[PDB]
Amino acid sequence: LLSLPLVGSLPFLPRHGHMHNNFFKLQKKYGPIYSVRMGTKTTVIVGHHQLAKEVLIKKGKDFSGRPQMATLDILSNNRKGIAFADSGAHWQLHRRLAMATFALFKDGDQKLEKIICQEISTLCDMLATHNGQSIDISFPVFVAVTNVISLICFNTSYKNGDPELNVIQNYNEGIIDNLSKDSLVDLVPWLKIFPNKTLEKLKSHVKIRNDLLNKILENYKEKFRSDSITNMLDTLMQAKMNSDQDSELLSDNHILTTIGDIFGAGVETTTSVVKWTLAFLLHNPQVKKKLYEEIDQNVGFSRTPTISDRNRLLLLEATIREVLRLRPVAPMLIPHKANVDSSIGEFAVDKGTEVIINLWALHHNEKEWHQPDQFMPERFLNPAGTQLISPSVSYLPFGAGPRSCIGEILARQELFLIMAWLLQRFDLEVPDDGQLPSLEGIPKVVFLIDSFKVKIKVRQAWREAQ
Ligand code: HEM
Ligand SMILES: C[C@]12CC[C@H](O)CC1=CC[C@@H]1[C@@H]2CC[C@]2(C)C(c3cccnc3)=CC[C@@H]12
Numbered sequence: 529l530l531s532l533p534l535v536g537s538l539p540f541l542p543r544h545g546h547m548h549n550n551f552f553k554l555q556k557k558y559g560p561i562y563s564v565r566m567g568t569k570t571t572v573i574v575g576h577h578q579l580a581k582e583v584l585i586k587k588g589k590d591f592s593g594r595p596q597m598a599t600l601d602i603l604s605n606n607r608k609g610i611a612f613a614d615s616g617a618h619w620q621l622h623r624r625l626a627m628a629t630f631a632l633f634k635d636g637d638q639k640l641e642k643i644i645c646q647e648i649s650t651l652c653d654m655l656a657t658h659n660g661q662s663i664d665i666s667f668p669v670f671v672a673v674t675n676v677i678s679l680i681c682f683n684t685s686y687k688n689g690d691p692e693l694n695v696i697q698n699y700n701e702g703i704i705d706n707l708s709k710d711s712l713v714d715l716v717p718w719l720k721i722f723p724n725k726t727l728e729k730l731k732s733h734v735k736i737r738n739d740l741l742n743k744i745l746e747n748y749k750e751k752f753r754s755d756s757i758t759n760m761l762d763t764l765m766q767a768k769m770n771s772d773q774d775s776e777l778l779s780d781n782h783i784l785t786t787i788g789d790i791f792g793a794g795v796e797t798t799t800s801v802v803k804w805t806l807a808f809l810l811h812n813p814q815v816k817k818k819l820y821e822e823i824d825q826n827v828g829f830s831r832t833p834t835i836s837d838r839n840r841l842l843l844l845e846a847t848i849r850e851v852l853r854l855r856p857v858a859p860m861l862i863p864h865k866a867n868v869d870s871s872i873g874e875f876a877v878d879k880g881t882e883v884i885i886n887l888w889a890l891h892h893n894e895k896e897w898h899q900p901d902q903f904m905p906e907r908f909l910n911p912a913g914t915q916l917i918s919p920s921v922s923y924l925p926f927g928a929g930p931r932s933c934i935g936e937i938l939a940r941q942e943l944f945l946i947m948a949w950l951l952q953r954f955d956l957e958v959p960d961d962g963q964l965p966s967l968e969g970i971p972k973v974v975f976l977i978d979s980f981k982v983k984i985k986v987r988q989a990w991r992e993a994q
Contacts, residue, residue: 538564538715546971547711548859548888551575555889561873566715569595571882572872575889577896577922579873583864583883587872588929589615593865595882598719599707602730605738609785610934611793615867618777622786625767627934629760633680638758641835643679644942647672648949649832654688655954655984662959662981665806670697670799673942677794680938681760681787682744695740700796702733704972711971713860713884741784741791760790793935796974797857798942803977805851805947807965808903810958810982815905818843823951829993833948835941841948842916846908848943849916852925854903855967859888859975861927887924896922955985 539558540550551573554562560576574580583591592615596607604612610626613619633640651672655665671693675685686693706729708714719726745761752765764786768778809816826840827833838845864883871877892900897920898907907919926933933939950956958964965980 542716543710546859546969547713548886548971551860551884551886552889552892560889561875564715566717569882570878571713571884572877573884573886574872575886576893577890577924580885580887580890580924581928582872583885584924584927584929584932587870588931590868590870591864591866591883592930593867594931595863595865597712598727599730600712602727602734603703603707604789605781605785608782609789611789611862614865615930617773618782621767621774621777622764622782623934625763626760626786626790629680629763630934630937632758632763638679640938640941641945644676644945645832645834645949647675647685648945650675650688651946652949652953655950656986658984659986660983662983664979664981665984666799666803666979667697669802669946670795672946673795673798676938676942677791679759680794681791682748683759692740695736699733699736700792703730703737704796704974704976706730706733707973711860712863712973737788738784741788742780745780745784760787790935794938797935798939800974800976801848801851801857801939801943802946803980804855805848805943806956806982807967807977807980808847808851808854809956810964811967812903815843815847815903816956819847819951823948824989827948827952829952829990833945833952835945837948838944841944842909842913843905844947844951845944846905846916848940848947849908849925850903850905853891853897853923854901855969855975855977856887856891856925857974858927859886859971861885861887862931864931885927887927890922890924893922896920953987953990955983955987957983957985959983 539554544550552575555575561572561574561579563570563572565571574583594607594612594614596614600612601607607613608618610619610623613622630640632638633643651668654668671686674693674696678685706726709718718724748761752762754766754769757763757766761783764778764783768775768783771778809819822841822843823833827837833841861884864885866877866879866881866883869877869879872883877883891897894900898904908916910917926936926939959981960983963980966978968978970976970978
């Protein structure tokens with residue numbers, strides 16, 4: 529009896545389980561690095577820290593490209609901006625300019641810390657009005673980080689109730705919904721196989737974002753003054769005029785897309801990580817208690833938390849690290865591409881090949897982490913409890929090398945201060961129908977969590993101390 533001709537083969541079911549996990553499970557059979565061919569395109573998945581660092585750092589330049597995707601073409605206006613732009617002059621310039629802008633916020637009058645604390649104050653005052661009630665903290669937190677990133681991009685913010693905030697939220701949700709069904713990584717390109725309206729819907733949401741950004745740029749062409757460079761838009765406009773090989777790379781569209789990447793990332797990443805952190809604390813009341821104890825003893829109630837408090841609030845800084853391990857914002861980073869013929873772990877990799885780092889695998893490798901599927905912030909502390917440690921070399925929440933996260937400083941500060949101020953001021957408890965958030969998650973371009981509610985109450989201790 530003969531065997532059928534095989535015209536296709538995939539190692540697991542599509543749309544069943546999470547991609548990053550399915551790739552991980554495959555490592556038991558096939559090892560830490562393997563490939564899949566889809567028509568013409570070849571993709572390599574890497575799931576061990578040694579090989580990953582070779583791709584991100586040692587041979588960083590070789591693998592610093594980004595593959596092209598139809599959905600991403602639309603969001604990025606054909607591969608402009610930073611995150612989805614191929615390696616090249618545009619990417620390098622705009623990335624550099626964006627980084628240079630965060631320097632303008634490291635100290636002084638417009639210090640990043642104060643900008644953030646300003647908006648966390650408004651957030652806390654608003655949340656306190658919901659004393660006694662169960663609520664979804666998504667929108668209130670969304671506003672807070674939106675204002676922070678707006679101040680950094682334009683030196684503007686939004687008053688309570690500005691409906692432009694509801695507009696942004698709508699298109700943010702719609703774009704994220706249609707940019708990918710699940711992860712950006714998608715074995716079969718269903719998009720091109722069956723008739724569908726994904727690109728149509730995606731365009732309609734992107735159009736609204738772009739119209740709003742254009743509106744902002746046009747209104748700002750007048751307020752721009754050369755001697756005063758205080759925000760990201762200033763920096764980008766100052767560069768364009770400074771010419772005078774550089775000027776074609778700073779068109780209006782190049783500038784808006786870059787601002788768009790920053791505005792989007794600044795808001796959806798940090799918002800997501802905050803929700804994830806709360807969710808874990810509702811599942812782990814023992815940890816939560818230890819965090820209240822820690823903050824009462826090291827900051828108390830006579831002032832509000834500041835960045836310098838990260839030197840004393842160690843369990844908090846560790847809790848954040850452990851969320852970023854267990855539920856990475858980008859569990860498969862963003863896809864990389866080989867710019868040139870090269871190699872990984874002595875295996876050949878052709879120019880143009882897609883390369884994916886399975887960070888989830890790195891963060892859950894059993895030989896590198898003790899009980900990796902557990903939420904244990906303790907692992908990032910010495911046994912004493914008195915200083916932070918790095919227990920594994922297999923940890924890269926913000927990536928590394930040329931395409932590493934450029935918003936890391938901002939993220940870490942936003943996350944630390946938000947959690948700090950909330951814990952000082954609020955009991956955050958399971959709602960009265962004792963529903964706990966699902967920790968399973970929803971993979972999109974970002975690793976999101978199902979919406980959930982939290983009962984919020986002002987703390988007796990915080991009240992007494994007024
Ligand atoms: C918890 C928060 C965040 C985490 C864990 C995070 C992590 C990451 C990761 C894993 C990557 C991909 C690295 C790669 O593709 O090799 C990335 C890229 C990027 N991140 Fe974030 N990020 C966070 C927040 C932010 C924020 C607040 C910004 C604000 C500007 C930002 C801006 C970017 C940009 C522009 C890229 C593209 C880099 C490039 O292609 O050159 N991120 N980030
Ligand atoms: C789609 C979205 C967010 C929805 C916006 O309407 C469009 C947008 C621009 C930037 C995207 C961002 C989602 C987060 C992305 C993909 C991101 C990011 C994501 C996670 C970690 N670090 C960076 C950088 C580009 C960011």
